[model samples]
Target chain A: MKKMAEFTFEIEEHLLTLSENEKGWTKEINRVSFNGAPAKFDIRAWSPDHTKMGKGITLSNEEFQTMVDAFKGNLEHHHHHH
Target chain B: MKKMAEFTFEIEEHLLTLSENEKGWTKEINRVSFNGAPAKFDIRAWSPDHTKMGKGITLSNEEFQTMVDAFKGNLEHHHHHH
Candidate 1:
């Protein structure tokens, strides 16, 4: 199979940084629009320079809320880390 | 920069199939353990055969709860599609 050209992305909003590894790369959650589509909830790992990234996921608001509702219903009392 | 060998994964549990596109690919939410690590909340797009995937997000239970709380706090009446 022919590999496609490298993709490009734009992070319209930096929502949060989830964690930073020893190498200074951070796992992040952001609102991102690919190509020129509407922004969605995006999670991925990025280099300190924001020029490189690891594999990640994107979810629309509907999908996110659905997951939230599902979690709330199936939440286990033993799962709390707090 | 040298590209590494393709990565391998295992979906520990299939929680839900969020959506399916015309191509028979699906955006899914599952509990996945990468390599041999503990499973986490994994959301990503997958081919029908589960042989290919797109960029996606993985969140631990803690991270996921944090996001849920954050959403609860900032939730807006204007944002609900229901």
Candidate 2:
């Protein structure tokens, strides 16, 4: 339940914030590890009042890598807005 | 493999982007379903270049509720930056 790490990345003006806590740890039935511990990480997007209006999700190790690969593999981009 | 839903919300000038796919369904072993189907929803935040800098979570029926409650319960906010 401790705040192990918190991050915010500002793109143009909107922001993405992640609050990583020790409580987010989980054990896969397979006990497989990525960075270690098979734990989950909490991630989110919020408004100024900190309302999670736009987005949120809990990422397991694999899901994290999936997105990572998507970026490196060049997911398509067609619009500057929306 | 089909695009089911996509959303973009702009707060100030930054954008929150989400891409939902039909493949994002998972039946809970518990299957104690909430809005029907123990399915998961994929969400994300992207940069103008559509980079996954601040994003990515797949929400099951249950995990999604946790974030909703956290927001409704008024998770605190301090400092506008970082």
Candidate 3:
């Protein structure tokens, strides 16, 4: 059997925070460039296949939107340049 | 002198996209767990340094907001278990 390969990426310069709540969880993330440039962001989501196992679960639209909104905010903030 | 060590981190399972415009650039990011999960996100930012050299630049509030928004969205979407 072929082994499933894991995926990885570079964060540049960013800080991530994960907070728990009654319904789900929230993540606050911030990033800076190599030169102390700071950028802040946050994301909220819920897992449909919540379990203590490995992978193979999915998130609902409400969950996905939370993340998308944060991302959009970040992009819109920098929309002028590129 | 101690060599400047670059910071690095694991992205778990996520997809990233960057778009360029007249002023700056925008980033769209998405992530999933080990088991084929899906989480989408986006970020937009502009650099004050605006240089073609190495690092050491700052981003405006608008730029930072872009990133912060994305992070918050992701976290909010998953605010239940953890």
Which number leads on TM-score? 1
lDDT of 3 by residue, A1-82 (tens): 6465543332343444433333443333333222333222222222334533211112234433544564565455545533
How close is every model to the real structure, measured as TM-score? Answer: 0.65, 0.25, 0.20
TM-score of chain B of each: 0.60, 0.32, 0.24
Q: Under CAPRI classification, how is model 3 graded?
A: incorrect
How big an interface RMSD has model 2?
13.1
Could you give candidate 1's per-residue lDDT for residues A2-77 as a string of tens digits? 5656455788888767667658677767888766577788777777665665777777887766766665545444
Which regions in candidate 3 have their CA more than 4 angstroms from the true location? A1-17, A20-82, B1-14, B18-22, B30-82
Model 2, C-alpha of A27: deviation from truth (Å): 27
Ranked by lDDT, top first: 1, 3, 2
What are the candidates' interface root-mean-square deviations?
A: 2.7, 13.1, 13.8
Candidate 1: which stretches are off by over 4 Å?
A: A1-10, A34-37, A49-53, A72-76, A80-82, B1-9, B34-37, B50-52, B76-82
User: How close to the true structure is residue B8 of candidate 1, measured as C-alpha lDDT?
Assistant: 60
lDDT preference between candidates 1 and 2, better one: 1
